[PDB]
């Protein structure tokens, strides 16, 4: 289908001693493939997947230099932001940045992101267009005239519509059996006597990819978001994901209900029922 | 491929 | 300034069977700030050999990790996840339920 790439960068200040924690990571759809970690020994960018490994030792060199620049950039940022918000030197603060591109099934550029947060909260992001900014407040309204004077938008447009995309295909083309796969879910359903006369019906979805999936309940042919339980989609460890929705019901009214699944992997929408 | 451009200080 | 307490799930990579090989996961999502502490217990003893994923984040900027450890289920064995965060009074112990 459509695909994407994202990079996630986090920096965390350590006031009472040290320089700041810096972690980076990249995802092609829901598969991690690279990572940098300031704290861990090597001080390299490290492959995290098997298909990416093949790239020669100047791929990694370039990536390592670039990643260290980002981390010097976040180093200065944290201190600037203390400046902007007249914050004490003895709190610990947090800068995340996230960016990357989406492509259509034609593999062409579809959209782009670039978003910046301080202490868990949107600070500045670029808008999804011929490029302008959205500043969360007057402190970030400052980084606006700053970034406008530097033509920062135009610099990212060029990367997002340019090398981000040109390079995304290089990873799809090369990681095909890991990245162009779409595993259907292995569905099943369990029953648990919980009360005197009120039971549970969990409906499980095991080992699927990609991670988008819907799991609805229906008492007698309508939606039922109220009275369910739906745990957030989790990853399994082996490249695929897990998920489940359950529902409390009255005893001897089990065949009333139907678990509905939608997924890319499924040509047709599925439906289970407490048959056993 | 991470960006050598954009990515400025605030 | 904004804090967010973690959401925990404990579960195996495959469905359980006494005496076969499997991985035990603790998946911690939605938290802020990032600094977190997560052990995996077996009969209430920290298991040293655990691994974990590179910290990443969601669409609302909250963080998530996965921790995991090779194991063999059995009837007598009892497995939990113990967790601390800047938002948590004492730690949070979440047991493993084979049917969760």
Numbering used by the authors:
A (entry chain A): 1 to 276
B (entry chain C): 1 to 10
C (entry chain B): 0 to 99
Q: What did the study's authors say about this model?
A:
A PS-CPL screen of the ST8.24 T-cell clone was used to generate a ranked list of predicted super-agonist peptides. The top 10 predicted peptides were tested for their ability to prime an HLA A2-EAAGIGILTV tetramer positive T-cell population from the blood of five healthy donors. CD8 T-cell clone ST8.24 showed good sensitivity to the 10 candidate super-agonist peptides when tested by peptide titration (concentration range 10−7-10−12 M) by MIP-1β ELISA.
The best-known example of such a heteroclitic peptide is derived from the Melan-A/MART-1 where the natural 10-mer epitope is EAAGIGILTV, as used in this study. This natural sequence does not have an optimal anchor residue at p2 for the HLA A2 restriction element. In summary, we used a T-cell clone derived from the TIL of a melanoma patient that persisted in patient PBMC after long-lasting tumour remission to generate a novel APL super-agonist peptide with the sequence MTSAIGILPV. This APL was capable of inducing greater numbers of T-cells specific for the natural antigen EAAGIGILTV from the PBMC of 14/14 healthy donors and 2/2 patients tested compared to the natural antigen itself.
